[PDB]
Design a protein around this ligand. Structure first.
Ligand SMILES: C=C1/C(=C\C=C2/CCC[C@]3(C)[C@@H]([C@H](C)[C@@H]4CC[C@H](C(C)(C)O)O4)CC[C@@H]23)C[C@@H](O)C[C@@H]1O
Ligand SMILES: C=C1/C(=C\C=C2/CCC[C@]3(C)[C@@H]([C@H](C)[C@@H]4CC[C@H](C(C)(C)O)O4)CC[C@@H]23)C[C@@H](O)C[C@@H]1O
Lengths: 238, 11, 238, 11
């Protein structure tokens, strides 16, 4: 069959929200502290902090996210932030160079660059393999933003209070996605299942990042290089 | 708690 | 008469400490977030945060500062930091341009630049007049570092516990300074008194900065642009 | 309190 008017509206809301909160020019990157080849921590902390602001604004056009309590919104953002960032970064990832190409050579981040920001191959290896698998799925823009909104409105996050409601919005987004794939995506007959498994990958990426971030945020000579937003969001402040 | 997050969610 | 061996040692310790913690090349400035013409807040926050690290290291070669309790050291640094920074910045201030010239044109800060970092002429006017008066005093390098060490080891700071001891080290530094002026500074017969009055100026500059910083640190869209070190040091965390 | 200051004063 076809998609309802309500699902078309949700799709249009989501991609407009992604378009407003993601700059294909990457021109704001000149305002981060410049990269140096833990030499990359200042630049990459700025990059993530900037990305967190974007993710907050994207969240902010998700239909129904705002109508949740401010505590639920904070819970959802704090535990899903790094996953949305990992997800959205696939738009700059390129299989030809196996890295993220945002500007010229200064703003291209390969594995060795992230190494010099306090992270090991235990995170980098699954992360790059995640970007590779997700890029080969060749998602439509609608599926990409749908996946990000589904990932963020997960009710199985610590701290969420109104599970019922969040799971409800997450379910309606899953049905829009599942329907958009079966109608407008040729040969997507197993795609949705694979996307749902990408979410599970993000959970394992999340936990190893949360571990590695802890060890660096617990050393003041390193956590002094982070930003207030990063510390607030990635800290266990509760 | 979460002074900046609150701020960025309002407006 | 002449200066004792002990006072020569103190002088040499102080200027070596200043030389190690102050870079006339200003070449680390490329690693701050770049200035933009509250557009200057990110660059100037980075500049101050970097300067705080330097001031800590300078403090760290002051003979006797380390032998104080770690709480006294924190008390002394938290309330004197912005004053030492105002003082040390006179080395880049130039009367010919009425601003601080550190790099090329990007790293020259005139009054309008600081305006766009959240500060009013109520602070900027006395600050620039302070830099002007202090630069026309044409201090020797020894007097400049002596003045900074005296300013930091002031026992009339909130939070200090061992007044006796800090006032003692402050007194010995004042007598080294007073003696160096009368012996090695031609026509300095009123200079020391004027330097002591510069300290009083710093107190009034300190308080108006503390007020203006409060109003900006209380707005999260602005305090998110500061650094962890700046927030820790300039906050009333106690 | 003052996690970074403590750190930068040691060493
Ligand atoms: C953040 C984005 C982009 C890339 C993101 C990347 C690629 C490089 C490595 C990054 C920055 C990860 C690292 C683990 C960084 C380095 C240090 C930082 C903290 C949070 C301090 O651990 O995380 C997080 C997402 C990873 C570029 C572009 O697609 C925009 C997107 O929002
Ligand atoms: C910090 C130094 C230099 C200049 C310092 C200046 C000149 C420009 C204006 C500055 C940065 C003042 C402002 C009030 C800045 C801007 C915002 C920032 C905070 C602390 C956020 O209020 O204070 C502090 C010392 C002022 C340059 C050089 O001499 C090194 C020296 O340590």
């Amino acid at each position: 069959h076809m998609l309802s008017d309500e699902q078309m509206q949700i799709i249009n809301s989501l991609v407009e929200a992604h378009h407003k909160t993601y700059d294909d020019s990457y021109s704001d990157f000149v305002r981060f502290r410049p990269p140096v080849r833990l030499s990359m921590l200042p630049h990459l902390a700025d990059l993530v902090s900037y990305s967190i602001q974007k993710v907050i604004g994207f969240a902010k056009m998700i239909p129904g996210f705002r109508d949740l309590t401010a505590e639920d919104q904070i819970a959802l953002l704090k535990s899903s932030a790094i996953e949305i960032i990992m997800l959205r970064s696939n738009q700059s990832f390129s299989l030809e160079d196996m890295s993220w190409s945002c500007g010229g050579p200064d703003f291209k981040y390969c594995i060795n660059d992230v190494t010099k920001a306090g992270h090991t191959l235990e995170l980098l290896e699954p992360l790059v393999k995640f970007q590779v698998g997700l890029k080969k799925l060749k998602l439509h823009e609608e599926e990409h933003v749908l996946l990000m909104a589904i990932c963020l409105l997960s009710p199985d996050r610590p701290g969420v209070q109104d599970h019922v409601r969040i799971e409800a919005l997450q379910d309606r987004l899953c049905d829009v996605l599942q329907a958009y794939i079966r109608i407008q995506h040729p040969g997507g007959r197993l795609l949705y299942a694979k996307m749902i498994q990408k979410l599970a990958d993000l959970r394992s990426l999340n936990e190893e990042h949360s571990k590695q971030y802890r060890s660096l945020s617990f050393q003041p000579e390193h956590s002094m290089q982070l930003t207030p937003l990063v510390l607030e969001v990635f800290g266990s402040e509760v | 708690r979460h002074k900046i997050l609150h701020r960025l969610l309002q407006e």
